[PDB]
Amino acid sequence: DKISHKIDIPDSAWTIGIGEKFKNAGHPNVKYPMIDDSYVQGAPLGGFGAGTIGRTYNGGFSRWHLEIGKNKYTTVYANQFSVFQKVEGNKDGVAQVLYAGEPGYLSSWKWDYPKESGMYYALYPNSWYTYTNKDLPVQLAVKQFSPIIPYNYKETSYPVAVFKWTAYNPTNKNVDVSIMFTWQNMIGFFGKQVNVNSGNFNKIIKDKSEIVAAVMGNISNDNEEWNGEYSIGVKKVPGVDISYKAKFVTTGDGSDLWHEFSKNGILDNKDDETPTKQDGIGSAIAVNFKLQPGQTIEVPFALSWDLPIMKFGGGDKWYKMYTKYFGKNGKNSFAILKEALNNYQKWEKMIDDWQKPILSNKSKPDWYKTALFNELYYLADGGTAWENGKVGERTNNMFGLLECFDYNYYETLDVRFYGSFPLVMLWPDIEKQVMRQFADTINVQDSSEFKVGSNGAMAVKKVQGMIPHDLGSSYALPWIKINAYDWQNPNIWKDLNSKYVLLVYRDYVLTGKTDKEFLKYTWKSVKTALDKLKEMDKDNDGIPDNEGIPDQTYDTWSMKGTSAYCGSLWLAALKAAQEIGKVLKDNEAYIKYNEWYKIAQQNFEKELWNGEYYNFDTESDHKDSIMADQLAGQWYADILRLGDILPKDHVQKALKKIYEFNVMKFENGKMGAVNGMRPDGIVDESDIQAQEVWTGVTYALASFMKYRGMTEEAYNTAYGVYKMTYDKSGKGYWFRTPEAWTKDGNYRASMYMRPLSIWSMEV
Numbered sequence: 001d002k003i004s005h006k007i008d009i010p011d012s013a014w015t016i017g018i019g020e021k022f023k024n025a026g027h028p029n030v031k032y033p034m035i036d037d038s039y040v041q042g043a044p045l046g047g048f049g050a051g052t053i054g055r056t057y058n059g060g061f062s063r064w065h066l067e068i069g070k071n072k073y074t075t076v077y078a079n080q081f082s083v084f085q086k087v088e089g090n091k092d093g094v095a096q097v098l099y100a101g102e103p104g105y106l107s108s109w110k111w112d113y114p115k116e117s118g119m120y121y122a123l124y125p126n127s128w129y130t131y132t133n134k135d136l137p138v139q140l141a142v143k144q145f146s147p148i149i150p151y152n153y154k155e156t157s158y159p160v161a162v163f164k165w166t167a168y169n170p171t172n173k174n175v176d177v178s179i180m181f182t183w184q185n186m187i188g189f190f191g192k193q194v195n196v197n198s199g200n201f202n203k204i205i206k207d208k209s210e211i212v213a214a215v216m217g218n219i220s221n222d223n224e225e226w227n228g229e230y231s232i233g234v235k236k237v238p239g240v241d242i243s244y245k246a247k248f249v250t251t252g253d254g255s256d257l258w259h260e261f262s263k264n265g266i267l268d269n270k271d272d273e274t275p276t277k278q279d280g281i282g283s284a285i286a287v288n289f290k291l292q293p294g295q296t297i298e299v300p301f302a303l304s305w306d307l308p309i310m311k312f313g314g315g316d317k318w319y320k321m322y323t324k325y326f327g328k329n330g331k332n333s334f335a336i337l338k339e340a341l342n343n344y345q346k347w348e349k350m351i352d353d354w355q356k357p358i359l360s361n362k363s364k365p366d367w368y369k370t371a372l373f374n375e376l377y378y379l380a381d382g383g384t385a386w387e388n389g390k391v392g393e394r395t396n397n398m399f400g401l402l403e404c405f406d407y408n409y410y411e412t413l414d415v416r417f418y419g420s421f422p423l424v425m426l427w428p429d430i431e432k433q434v435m436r437q438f439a440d441t442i443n444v445q446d447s448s449e450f451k452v453g454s455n456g457a458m459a460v461k462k463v464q465g466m467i468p469h470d471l472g473s474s475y476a477l478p479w480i481k482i483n484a485y486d487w488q489n490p491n492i493w494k495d496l497n498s499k500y501v502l503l504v505y506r507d508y509v510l511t512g513k514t515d516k517e518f519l520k521y522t523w524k525s526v527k528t529a530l531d532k533l534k535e536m537d538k539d540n541d542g543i544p545d546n547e548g549i550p551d552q553t554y555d556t557w558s559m560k561g562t563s564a565y566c567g568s569l570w571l572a573a574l575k576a577a578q579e580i581g582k583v584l585k586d587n588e589a590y591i592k593y594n595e596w597y598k599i600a601q602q603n604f605e606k607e608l609w610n611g612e613y614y615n616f617d618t619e620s621d622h623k624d625s626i627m628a629d630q631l632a633g634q635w636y637a638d639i640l641r642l643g644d645i646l647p648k649d650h651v652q653k654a655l656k657k658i659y660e661f662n663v664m665k666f667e668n669g670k671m672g673a674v675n676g677m678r679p680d681g682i683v684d685e686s687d688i689q690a691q692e693v694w695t696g697v698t699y700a701l702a703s704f705m706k707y708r709g710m711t712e713e714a715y716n717t718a719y720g721v722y723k724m725t726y727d728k729s730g731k732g733y734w735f736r737t738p739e740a741w742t743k744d745g746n747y748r749a750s751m752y753m754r755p756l757s758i759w760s761m762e763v
Ligand SMILES: [Ca+2]
Pocket: 536, 537, 538, 539, 540, 541, 542, 543, 544, 545, 561, 562
């Protein structure tokens, strides 16, 4: 490997061999159907709200999130990089697709890129491949990325990727090299109900100011989710020549293209705008160059996708964010690609600038850096919706991130309490917009009834003064029809209204305690939320009562009476609202929430403190279980700088107990914090959720330990999550971190919002 020296891959990059076969991957542990797309995954390409494309470590473009809210895992075989090499003085060269697999169609191409001949690396938003093959004398690498940039709401939105190639000749002979990008005209891949290829056509643009690009579109001007353009292209650099082929048939053997490329690495330069009928078609862009001994060359390619309209299953059509910058008519893929090819070096430097403070901190282990950056994949990958107007129709751009794909709910608030740390820390204007969306819902009432999945009772959809569980589903009407989730009735949940208040005050504190206007916007809703939750205190101890039914985020784990979890969240939310009332000079609110806080705090301690930890609750059969998340309210109080809600000594005892038990008694501390443990050191079997590790709960718990000076415990607690997710000894969950796993390592709900809580460790 001579090429690693010519490029700059950080040591914290997650690595795997191209074509590596991972043994003992995990699978779902539920009885009902659940997504399992295998361990062949990679860092995604694409901006927020753009739709994303997962290119795997094997090289294939395979995990398609272009239909916003949907996950479609299928390798589109035509979409590849390929290489040709010929040593000067040899009769023939060699050509090879850079994909460790094979299709079917395209039989003429050279498939099956060999094992032990290159590596994949990822430190999101960058990823790299290196090609170090005994039969390719010139070594190659590519750095691929999208311009995902904190505090930037422009380039971060773009439907674009850059592929910056480096080629180096370590031999003492001249070598002719070509690199070719092929792409299928994928108009019609989704959204089009009939005639899926009909009207697709490809054009070639030559911009000599030099860029050569293919634009793959359709003759129709219909404004529908399926219509728009893909583009691939390359920028000329000194010493390379460009060739292209506008149209090859993807539903054929591929030899129309491959007989050209495999001869001398130079395409026919044949333009052909003829639309197709039933055949699939594609385009190819190639560079050819001669490398002398010891020579390096760098050449950038790009990919864009102008698919301006997203459609949701309830019928609404919206423009995607990036259309603010490029237009809405679906004929702008070249403009996007050109912007990338002319600015990518600037984008690289912007990414480096944001990653450097963390990477350069030599007190932090590399594994922690691997996880911290790579868990950010989900902000783009999570079905992200970011609108720039309804089709046919404002100041703001509404946003939503999915819980996951299995449970297709936007912005699920009980989960975003954990998962939204990156947004407040790195994209705070998005965060505050999401919270205003919630503020706007609090007094919505919908008295129509739904059947509750868990018990088949009927319940009201949305109750005035209750915060909604979620802002809809991609199968229905995001932002318009809220509370799509129906397994339980969230109108009686005991965590949502407290978590809402906590999120609001968090968002003020972590953006510098300056945004009084945000506090003013949300203040009515904060007071309403707490006032409604107080009505659920049926025994007058000052604390809302859990009802012996899963009425909080652990939506199968029953809490009854006063719980540590909901009780502590309530205490913290009261303390937050007192502080907001001080800031806004609302005396009656300050006085009232202070009174409620002092009574609730005294009763919480009396009811739950056992001398070692806080009991799970007051009335359940396993009320003395040790819950990993028992002090969630004090965790957030630390972040919000609200001081001690509970005594320091008791918090420290509780954290030490959770480490000793839920971590170190659970598979020797190598898999995270199990949710519930009995005081005899045995995992609590009262519900499945008690026997699960929740990845995002565990990362949050690690930040709480860290703030409380339990440094070793904090990083040991988090390390098990990192190991399970990314290490050779784990279960193969990279770029699909799940909600949960059990002792056996098998999972529930891959591609999950909650583990974004790792960013709470950077507060
Ligand atoms: Ca009570």
